[PDB]
From a paper:
The oxidative part of this network consists of two monomeric DsbAs ([name] and [name]) related to EcDsbL, which cooperate with one DsbB. The solved structures of both CjDsbAs, especially the length and amino acid sequences of their L2 and L3 loops that are essential elements of the monomeric thiol oxidoreductases, were different from that of EcDsbA but similar, though not identical, to that of EcDsbL, which affected their functioning.
CjDsbA1 crystallized in the C2 and P212121 space group containing two monomers in the ASU for the monoclinic form and one molecule per ASU for the orthorhombic form, while CjDsbA2 crystallized in P3221 with a single chain in the ASU. The entire length of the polypeptide could be traced for CjDsbA2, except for the C-terminal HisTag. This was due to differences in protein purification procedures. In contrast, the CjDsbA2 experiment was performed under native conditions (without DTT), as the CjDsbA2 reduced form did not bind to the Ni-charged resin. Additionally, the observed effect may have been caused by the prolonged process of CjDsbA2 crystallization (several months) and spontaneous air oxidation or, alternatively, by a photoreduction in CjDsbA1 during X-ray data collection. Redox potentials for both CjDsbA1 and CjDsbA2 were within the limit characteristic for monomeric DsbA oxidative activity (−60 mV for CjDsbA1 and −116 mV for CjDsbA2). However, in contrast to CjDsbA1, which in cells lacking its redox partner, was mainly present in a reduced form, the lack of CjDsbB led to almost undetectable levels of CjDsbA2.
Numbering used by the authors: 1 to 194
The structure:
């Protein structure tokens, strides 16, 4: 509960993020994979059901960060329409992250280092069971523009301590040395979110 020990105050806050825990992550981030395997954010949601939980991908990370942002924005949008929390293991967000984490870390896939975005999109499109056209049409919408703009802030936040980064109410990033357990993450989030 002390600035500079458990948390820092972001110089610029995430817009529209009151009463929320947001995980800034990358598909090519190993600890992000760990936190997905043990569904950390889902554990927080269980103990703090009334917060909003989001995942902000980091477009500046990986050869395909910019394409991943599109796919995750589409998953977030659809999870929203479907009223499934993105920390739910049945969400499209979770299914998409699982597929990319699996591909990147277990299969050591790199999709030709940036030269084959079609193969990269396909992992996410298959995971969501939608077509490339669905994605192209989503990307024409204002809802897509808003999600993709909101994700821009994940890039400067990721430079504070790397990924994953945990941001509460859009204003405070939990300092990673303070997160010694999901219990600690929950306690800190509960303190910072009131």
């Amino acid at each position: 509960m002390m600035e500079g020990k458990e948390y820092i105050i972001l110089k610029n806050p995430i817009a529209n993020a009151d009463n929320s825990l947001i995980e800034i992550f990358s598909y090519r981030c190993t600890h992000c994979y760990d936190h997905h395997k043990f569904n950390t954010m889902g554990k927080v949601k269980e103990k703090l059901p009334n917060l909003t939980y989001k995942f902000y991908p980091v477009s500046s990370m990986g050869d395909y960060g910019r394409q991943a942002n599109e796919i995750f924005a589409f998953a977030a949008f659809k999870d929203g329409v479907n009223k499934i929390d993105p920390t739910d293991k049945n969400s499209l967000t979770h299914k998409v992250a699982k597929a990319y984490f699996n591909a990147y870390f277990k299969k050591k896939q790199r999709w030709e280092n940036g030269k084959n975005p079609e193969a990269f999109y396909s992992v996410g499109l298959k995971a969501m069971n939608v077509s490339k056209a669905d994605l192209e049409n989503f990307l024409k919408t204002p809802e897509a523009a808003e999600l993709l703009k909101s994700y821009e802030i994940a890039n400067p936040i990721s430079q504070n301590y790397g990924t994953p980064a945990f941001v509460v109410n859009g204003k405070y990033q939990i300092i990673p040395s303070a997160i010694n357990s999901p219990e600690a993450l929950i306690e800190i989030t509960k303190e910072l979110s009131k």
